[PDB]
Short mmCIF file of C-alpha atoms and ligand atoms in Angstrom, two decimals:
data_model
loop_
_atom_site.label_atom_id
_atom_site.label_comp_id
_atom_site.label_asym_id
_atom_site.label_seq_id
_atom_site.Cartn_x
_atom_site.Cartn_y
_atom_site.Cartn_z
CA UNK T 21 -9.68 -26.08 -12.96
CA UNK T 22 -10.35 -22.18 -12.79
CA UNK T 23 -7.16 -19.55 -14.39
CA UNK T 24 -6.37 -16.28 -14.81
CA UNK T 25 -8.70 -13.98 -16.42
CA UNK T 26 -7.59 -11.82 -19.48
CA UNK T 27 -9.81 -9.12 -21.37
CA UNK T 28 -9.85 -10.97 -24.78
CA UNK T 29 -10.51 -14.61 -22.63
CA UNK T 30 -14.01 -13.71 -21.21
CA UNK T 31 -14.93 -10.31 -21.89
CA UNK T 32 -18.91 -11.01 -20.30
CA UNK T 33 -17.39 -10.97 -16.62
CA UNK T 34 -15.41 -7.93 -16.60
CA UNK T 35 -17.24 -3.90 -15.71
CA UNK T 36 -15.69 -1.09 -16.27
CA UNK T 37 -15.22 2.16 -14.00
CA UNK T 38 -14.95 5.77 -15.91
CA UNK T 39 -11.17 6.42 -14.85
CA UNK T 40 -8.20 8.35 -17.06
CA UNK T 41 -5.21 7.11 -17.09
CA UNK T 42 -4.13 10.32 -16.01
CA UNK T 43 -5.82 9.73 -12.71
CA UNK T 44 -4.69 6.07 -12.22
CA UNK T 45 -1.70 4.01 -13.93
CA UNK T 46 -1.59 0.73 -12.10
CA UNK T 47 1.79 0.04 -13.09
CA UNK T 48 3.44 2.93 -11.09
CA UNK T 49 0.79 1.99 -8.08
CA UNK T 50 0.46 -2.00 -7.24
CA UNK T 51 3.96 -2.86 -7.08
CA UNK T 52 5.53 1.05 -5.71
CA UNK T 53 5.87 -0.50 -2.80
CA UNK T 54 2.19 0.48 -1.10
CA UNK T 55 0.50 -3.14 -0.88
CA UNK T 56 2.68 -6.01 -1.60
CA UNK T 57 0.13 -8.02 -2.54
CA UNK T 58 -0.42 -7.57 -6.53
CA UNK T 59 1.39 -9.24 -9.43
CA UNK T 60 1.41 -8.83 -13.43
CA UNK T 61 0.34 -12.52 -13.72
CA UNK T 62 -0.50 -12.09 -17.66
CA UNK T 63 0.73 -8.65 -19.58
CA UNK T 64 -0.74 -5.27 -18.55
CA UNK T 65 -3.57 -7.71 -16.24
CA UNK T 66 -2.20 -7.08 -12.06
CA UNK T 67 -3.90 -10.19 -9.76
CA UNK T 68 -4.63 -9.30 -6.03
CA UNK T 69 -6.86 -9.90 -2.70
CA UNK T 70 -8.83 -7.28 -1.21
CA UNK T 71 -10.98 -8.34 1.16
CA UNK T 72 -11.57 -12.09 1.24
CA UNK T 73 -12.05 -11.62 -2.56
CA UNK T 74 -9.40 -12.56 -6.10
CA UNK T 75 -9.36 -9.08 -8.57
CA UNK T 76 -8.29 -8.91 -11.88
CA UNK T 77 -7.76 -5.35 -13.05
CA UNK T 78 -6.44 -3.79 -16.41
CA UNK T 79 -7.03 -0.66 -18.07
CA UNK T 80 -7.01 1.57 -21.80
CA UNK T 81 -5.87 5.08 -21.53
CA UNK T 82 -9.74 6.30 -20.65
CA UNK T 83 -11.24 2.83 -18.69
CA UNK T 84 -9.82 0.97 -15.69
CA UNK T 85 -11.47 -2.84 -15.76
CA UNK T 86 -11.73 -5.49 -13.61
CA UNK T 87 -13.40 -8.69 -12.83
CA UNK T 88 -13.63 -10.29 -9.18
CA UNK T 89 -13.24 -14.23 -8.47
CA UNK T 90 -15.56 -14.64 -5.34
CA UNK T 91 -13.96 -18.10 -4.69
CA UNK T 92 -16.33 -20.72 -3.62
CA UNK T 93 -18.80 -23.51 -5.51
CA UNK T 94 -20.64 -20.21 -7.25
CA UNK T 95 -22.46 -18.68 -10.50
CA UNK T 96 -19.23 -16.72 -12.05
CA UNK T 97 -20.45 -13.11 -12.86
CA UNK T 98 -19.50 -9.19 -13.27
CA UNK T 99 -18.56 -6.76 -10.91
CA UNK T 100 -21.66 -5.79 -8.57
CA UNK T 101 -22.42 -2.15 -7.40
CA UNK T 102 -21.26 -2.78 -3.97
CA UNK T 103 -17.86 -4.63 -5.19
CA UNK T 104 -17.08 -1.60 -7.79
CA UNK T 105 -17.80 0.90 -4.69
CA UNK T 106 -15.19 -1.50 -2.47
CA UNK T 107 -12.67 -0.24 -5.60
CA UNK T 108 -13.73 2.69 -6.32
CA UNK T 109 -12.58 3.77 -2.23
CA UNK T 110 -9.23 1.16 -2.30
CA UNK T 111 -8.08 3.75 -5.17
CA UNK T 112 -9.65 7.40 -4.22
CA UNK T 113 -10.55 8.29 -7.29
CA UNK T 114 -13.25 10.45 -5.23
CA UNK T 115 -9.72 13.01 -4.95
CA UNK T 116 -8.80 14.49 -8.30
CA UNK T 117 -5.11 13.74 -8.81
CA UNK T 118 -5.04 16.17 -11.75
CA UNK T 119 -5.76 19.17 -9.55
CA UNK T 120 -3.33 18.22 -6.82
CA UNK T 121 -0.87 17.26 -9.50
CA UNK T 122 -1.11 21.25 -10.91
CA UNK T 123 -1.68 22.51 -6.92
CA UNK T 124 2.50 20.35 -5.72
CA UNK T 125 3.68 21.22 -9.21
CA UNK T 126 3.16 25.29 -8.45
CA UNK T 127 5.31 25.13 -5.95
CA UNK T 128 8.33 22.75 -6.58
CA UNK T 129 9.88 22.58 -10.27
CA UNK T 130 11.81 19.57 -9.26
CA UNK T 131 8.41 17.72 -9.21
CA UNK T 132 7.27 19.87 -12.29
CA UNK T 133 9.32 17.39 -13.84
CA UNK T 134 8.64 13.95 -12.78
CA UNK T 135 5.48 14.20 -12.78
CA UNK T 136 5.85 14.51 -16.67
CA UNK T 137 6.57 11.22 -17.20
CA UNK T 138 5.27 9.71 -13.96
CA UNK T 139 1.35 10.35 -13.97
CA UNK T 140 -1.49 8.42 -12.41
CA UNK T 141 0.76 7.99 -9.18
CA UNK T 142 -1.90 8.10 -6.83
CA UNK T 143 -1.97 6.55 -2.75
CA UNK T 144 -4.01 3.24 -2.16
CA UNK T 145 -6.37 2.80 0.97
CA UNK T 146 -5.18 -0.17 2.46
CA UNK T 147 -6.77 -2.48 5.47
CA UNK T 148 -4.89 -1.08 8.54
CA UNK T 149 -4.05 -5.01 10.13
CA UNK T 150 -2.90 -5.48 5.90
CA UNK T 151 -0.82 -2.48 5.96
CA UNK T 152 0.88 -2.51 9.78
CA UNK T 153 1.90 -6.45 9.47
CA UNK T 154 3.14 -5.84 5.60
CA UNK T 155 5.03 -2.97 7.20
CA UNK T 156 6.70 -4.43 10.21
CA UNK T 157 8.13 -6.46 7.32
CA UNK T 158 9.43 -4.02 5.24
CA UNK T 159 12.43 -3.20 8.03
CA UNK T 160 15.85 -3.84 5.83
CA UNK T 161 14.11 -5.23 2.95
CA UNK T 162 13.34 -4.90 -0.96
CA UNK T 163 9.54 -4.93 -2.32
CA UNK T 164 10.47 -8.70 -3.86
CA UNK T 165 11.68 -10.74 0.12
CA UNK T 166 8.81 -8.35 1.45
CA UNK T 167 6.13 -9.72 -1.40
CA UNK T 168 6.95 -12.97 -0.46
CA UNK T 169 6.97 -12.62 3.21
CA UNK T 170 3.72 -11.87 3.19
CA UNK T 171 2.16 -13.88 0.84
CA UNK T 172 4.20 -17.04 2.93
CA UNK T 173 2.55 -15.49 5.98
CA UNK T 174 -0.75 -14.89 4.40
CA UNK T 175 -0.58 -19.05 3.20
CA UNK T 176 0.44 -20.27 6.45
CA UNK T 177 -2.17 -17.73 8.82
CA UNK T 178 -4.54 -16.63 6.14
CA UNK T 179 -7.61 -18.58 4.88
CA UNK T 180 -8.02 -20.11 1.40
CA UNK T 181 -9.97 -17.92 -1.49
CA UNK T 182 -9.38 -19.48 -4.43
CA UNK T 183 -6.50 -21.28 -6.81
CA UNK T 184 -5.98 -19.42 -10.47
CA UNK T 185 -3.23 -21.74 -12.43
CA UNK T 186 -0.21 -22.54 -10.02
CA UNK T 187 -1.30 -19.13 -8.00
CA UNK T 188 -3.50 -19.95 -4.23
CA UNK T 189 -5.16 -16.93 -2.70
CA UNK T 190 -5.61 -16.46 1.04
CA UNK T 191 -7.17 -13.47 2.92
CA UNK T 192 -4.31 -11.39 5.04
CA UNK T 193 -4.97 -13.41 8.56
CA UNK T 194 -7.10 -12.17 11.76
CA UNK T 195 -4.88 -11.20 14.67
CA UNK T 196 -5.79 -14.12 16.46
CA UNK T 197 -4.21 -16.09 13.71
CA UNK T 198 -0.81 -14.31 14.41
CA UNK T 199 -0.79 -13.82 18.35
CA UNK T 200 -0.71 -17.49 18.93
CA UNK T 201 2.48 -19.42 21.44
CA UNK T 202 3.43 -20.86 18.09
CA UNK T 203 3.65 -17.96 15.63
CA UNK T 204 6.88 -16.63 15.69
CA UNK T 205 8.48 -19.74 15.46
CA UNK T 206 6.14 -20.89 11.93
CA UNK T 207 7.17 -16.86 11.09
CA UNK T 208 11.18 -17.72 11.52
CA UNK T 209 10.89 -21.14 9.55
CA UNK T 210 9.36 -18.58 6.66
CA UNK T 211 11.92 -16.49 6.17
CA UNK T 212 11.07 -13.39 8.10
CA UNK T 213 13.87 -13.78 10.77
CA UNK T 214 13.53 -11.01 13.63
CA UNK T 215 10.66 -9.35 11.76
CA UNK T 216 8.66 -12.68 13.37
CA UNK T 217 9.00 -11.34 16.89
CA UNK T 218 7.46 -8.06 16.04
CA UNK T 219 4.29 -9.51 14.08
CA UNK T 220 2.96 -11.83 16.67
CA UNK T 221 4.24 -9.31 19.95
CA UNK T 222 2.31 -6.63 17.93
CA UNK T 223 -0.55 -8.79 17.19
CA UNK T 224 -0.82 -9.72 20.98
CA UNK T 225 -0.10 -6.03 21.89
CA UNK T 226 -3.28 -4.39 19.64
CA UNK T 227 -5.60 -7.78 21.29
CA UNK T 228 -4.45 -7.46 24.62
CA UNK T 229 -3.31 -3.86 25.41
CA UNK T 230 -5.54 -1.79 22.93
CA UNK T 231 -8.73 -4.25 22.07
CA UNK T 232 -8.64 -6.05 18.70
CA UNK T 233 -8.86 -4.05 15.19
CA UNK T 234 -11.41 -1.60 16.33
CA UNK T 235 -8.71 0.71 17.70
CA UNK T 236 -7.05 0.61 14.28
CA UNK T 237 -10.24 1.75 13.33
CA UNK T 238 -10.63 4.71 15.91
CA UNK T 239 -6.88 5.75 14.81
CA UNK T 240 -8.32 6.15 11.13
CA UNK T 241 -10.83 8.82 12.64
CA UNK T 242 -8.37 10.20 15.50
CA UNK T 243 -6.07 13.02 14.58
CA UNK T 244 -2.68 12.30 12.65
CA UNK T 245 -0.58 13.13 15.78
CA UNK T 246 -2.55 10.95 18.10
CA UNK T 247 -2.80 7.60 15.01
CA UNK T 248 1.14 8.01 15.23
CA UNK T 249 2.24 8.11 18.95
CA UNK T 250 -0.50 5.55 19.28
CA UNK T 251 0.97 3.23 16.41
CA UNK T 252 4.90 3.92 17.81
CA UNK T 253 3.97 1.81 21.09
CA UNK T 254 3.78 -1.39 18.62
CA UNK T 255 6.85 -3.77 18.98
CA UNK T 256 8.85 -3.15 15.54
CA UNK T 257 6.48 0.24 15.22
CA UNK T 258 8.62 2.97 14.46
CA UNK T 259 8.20 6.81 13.31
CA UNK T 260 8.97 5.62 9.70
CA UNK T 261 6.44 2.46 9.42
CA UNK T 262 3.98 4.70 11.78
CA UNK T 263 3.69 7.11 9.13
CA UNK T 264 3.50 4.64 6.49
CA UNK T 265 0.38 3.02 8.43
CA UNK T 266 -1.20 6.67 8.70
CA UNK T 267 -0.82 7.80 4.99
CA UNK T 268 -2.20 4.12 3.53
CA UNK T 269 -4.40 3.40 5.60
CA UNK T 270 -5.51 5.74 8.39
CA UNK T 271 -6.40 8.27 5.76
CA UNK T 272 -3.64 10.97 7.01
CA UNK T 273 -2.34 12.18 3.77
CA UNK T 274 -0.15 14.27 5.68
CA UNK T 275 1.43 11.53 6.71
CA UNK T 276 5.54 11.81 4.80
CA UNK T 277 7.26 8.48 5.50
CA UNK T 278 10.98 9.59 5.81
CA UNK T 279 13.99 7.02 6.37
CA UNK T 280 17.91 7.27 4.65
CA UNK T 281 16.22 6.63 1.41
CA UNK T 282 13.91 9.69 1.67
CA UNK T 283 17.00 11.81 3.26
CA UNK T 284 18.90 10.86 -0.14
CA UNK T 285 16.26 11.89 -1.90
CA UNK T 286 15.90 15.39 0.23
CA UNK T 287 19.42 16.42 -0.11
CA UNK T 288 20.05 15.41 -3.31
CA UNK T 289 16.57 16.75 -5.28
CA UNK T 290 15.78 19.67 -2.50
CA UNK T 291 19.21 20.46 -1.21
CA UNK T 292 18.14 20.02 2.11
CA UNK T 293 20.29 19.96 5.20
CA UNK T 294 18.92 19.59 8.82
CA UNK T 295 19.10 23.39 10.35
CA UNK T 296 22.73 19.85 14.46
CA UNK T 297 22.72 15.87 13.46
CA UNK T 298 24.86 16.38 10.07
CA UNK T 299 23.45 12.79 9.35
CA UNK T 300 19.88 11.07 9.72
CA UNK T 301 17.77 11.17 13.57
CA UNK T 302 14.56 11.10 14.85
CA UNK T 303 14.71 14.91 15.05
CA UNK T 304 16.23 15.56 11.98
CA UNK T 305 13.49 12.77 10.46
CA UNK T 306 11.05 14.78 11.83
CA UNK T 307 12.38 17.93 11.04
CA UNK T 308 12.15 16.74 6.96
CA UNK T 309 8.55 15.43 6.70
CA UNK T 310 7.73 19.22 8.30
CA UNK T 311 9.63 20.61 5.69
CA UNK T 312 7.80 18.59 2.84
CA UNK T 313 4.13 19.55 4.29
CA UNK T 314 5.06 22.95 4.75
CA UNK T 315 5.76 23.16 0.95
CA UNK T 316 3.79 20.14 -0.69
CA UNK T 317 0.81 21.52 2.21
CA UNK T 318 -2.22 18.38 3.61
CA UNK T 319 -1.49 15.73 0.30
CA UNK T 320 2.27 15.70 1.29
CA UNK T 321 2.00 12.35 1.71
CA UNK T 322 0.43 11.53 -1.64
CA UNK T 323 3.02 13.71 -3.75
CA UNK T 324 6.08 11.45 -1.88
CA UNK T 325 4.37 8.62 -3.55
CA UNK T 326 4.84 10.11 -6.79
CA UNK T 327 8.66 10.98 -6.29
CA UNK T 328 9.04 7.79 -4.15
CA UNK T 329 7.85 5.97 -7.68
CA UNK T 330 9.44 7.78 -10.38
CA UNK T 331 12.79 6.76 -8.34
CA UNK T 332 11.68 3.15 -8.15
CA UNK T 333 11.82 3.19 -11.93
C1 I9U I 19 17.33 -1.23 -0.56
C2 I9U I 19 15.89 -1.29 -1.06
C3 I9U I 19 15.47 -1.72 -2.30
C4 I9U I 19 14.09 -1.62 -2.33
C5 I9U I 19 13.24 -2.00 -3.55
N1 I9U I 19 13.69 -1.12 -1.15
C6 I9U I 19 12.45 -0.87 -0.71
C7 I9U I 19 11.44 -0.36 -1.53
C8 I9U I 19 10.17 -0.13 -1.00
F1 I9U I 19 9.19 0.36 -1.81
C9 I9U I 19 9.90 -0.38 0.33
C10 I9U I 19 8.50 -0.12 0.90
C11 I9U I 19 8.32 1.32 1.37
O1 I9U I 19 8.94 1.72 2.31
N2 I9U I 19 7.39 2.18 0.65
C12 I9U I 19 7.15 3.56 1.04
N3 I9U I 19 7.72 4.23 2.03
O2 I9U I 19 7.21 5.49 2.06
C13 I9U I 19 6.28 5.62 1.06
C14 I9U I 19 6.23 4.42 0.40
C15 I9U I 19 5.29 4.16 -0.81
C16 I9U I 19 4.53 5.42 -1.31
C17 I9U I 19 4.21 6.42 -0.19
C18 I9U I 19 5.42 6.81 0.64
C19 I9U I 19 10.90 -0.88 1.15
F2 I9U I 19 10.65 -1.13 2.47
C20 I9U I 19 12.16 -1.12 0.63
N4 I9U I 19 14.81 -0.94 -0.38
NI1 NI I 20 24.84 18.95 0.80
#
């Protein structure tokens, strides 16, 4: 009945937001491995929910545009004020990317480099519930069985938005939805295996043992240190998918994700070497994403992203 929107199909429900492509390049952003919950559905146009709501977004080299599917029995029209703002803060573009670009790049020649090529790398604010769940999957995985985890999940727990072609939307699910006697069980039969056990004992521990998604929203205000050690008491929480959480969607840019693949990275790019544990630790973990803030400084986070990308590709 309703399909993907393109630019050329229906240019009257599209609005544009004033963005270089300097400052943004979705292709190096929706699928890096940040949300897992975009796809390229037609060329250069990525398809996504964010907040109960379908976007369409493509861009020129000056102009990022996008038009929203509200899903339900209503009027189709543009962008509103409100919906554009919504975007507008799920992509920072308040933070120039330019200037911190210049600011990492001072510093570290190695990134001098990369970000050459690799431009418009810039960190997403997720939903925290979004961004923990999708994360608790991401445990000996690949972006591809971790996109489809979630949007299984999101089918089976999530409610219905809207159907574009062969493509049905749902909303991530409530924690409710995922704490039930019945959950893990559904979660095994899709695929995620042990991951199951973590999502629905972490959805029951946040209801039961810290309140409901309000205290994800006090860890978004609390201090980085305190978000963390507060996140690490999840089931399947650990000092790698606790920083994730903190630099998506707690707004600790800080934050420096580090796991083997980051250690690789390290050593290989920095010629870093823990100064006891000749191999990877939580001490010598912790020990690396000090070393990258005390050189990359408070956006640490958000110039891993753009090495973290470039090496994706
Ligand atoms: C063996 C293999 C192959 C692939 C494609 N992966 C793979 C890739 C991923 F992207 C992710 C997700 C992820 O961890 N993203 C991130 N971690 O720190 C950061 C990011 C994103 C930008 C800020 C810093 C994963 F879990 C696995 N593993
Ligand atoms: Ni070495």
């Amino acid at each position: 009945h309703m399909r993907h929107r393109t630019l050329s199909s229906s240019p009257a429900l599209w609005a544009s937001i004033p963005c270089p492509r300097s400052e943004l390049r979705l292709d190096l952003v929706l699928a890096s491995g940040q949300s897992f919950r975009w796809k390229e559905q037609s060329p250069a146009h990525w398809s996504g929910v964010l907040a109960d709501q379908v976007w369409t977004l493509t861009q020129t080299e000056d102009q990022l545009y996008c038009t929203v599917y509200r899903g339900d029995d209503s009027q189709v029209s543009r962008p509103t004020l409100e919906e554009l703002e919504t975007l507008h803060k799920y992509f920072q573009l308040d933070v120039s990317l330019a200037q911190l670009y210049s600011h990492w790049a001072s510093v570290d020649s190695h990134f001098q480099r990369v970000a050459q090529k690799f431009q418009g790398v810039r960190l997403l604010r997720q939903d925290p519930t979004e961004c923990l769940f999708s994360f608790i999957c991401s445990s000996n995985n690949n972006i591809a069985r971790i996109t489809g985890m979630v949007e299984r999940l999101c089918q089976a727990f999530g409610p219905r938005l809207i159907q574009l072609d062969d493509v049905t939307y749902h909303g991530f699910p409530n924690l409710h939805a995922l704490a039930g006697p019945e959950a893990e069980t559904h979660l095994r039969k899709l695929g995620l295996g042990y991951r199951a056990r973590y999502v629905r004992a972490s959805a029951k521990a946040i209801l039961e043992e810290q309140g409901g998604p309000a205290w994800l929203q006090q860890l978004r205000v609390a201090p980085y240190e305190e978000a963390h050690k507060a996140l690490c008491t999840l089931p399947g929480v650990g000092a790698k998918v606790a920083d994730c959480i903190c630099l998506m969607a707690l707004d600790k840019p800080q934050a420096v994700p580090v796991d083997v693949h980051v250690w690789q990275i390290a050593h290989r790019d920095y010629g870093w070497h823990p100064k006891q544990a000749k191999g990877p630790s939580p001490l010598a973990n912790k020990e690396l994403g000090n070393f990258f803030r005390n050189l990359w400084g408070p956006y640490a986070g958000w110039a891993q992203a753009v090495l973290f990308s470039a090496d994706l590709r």
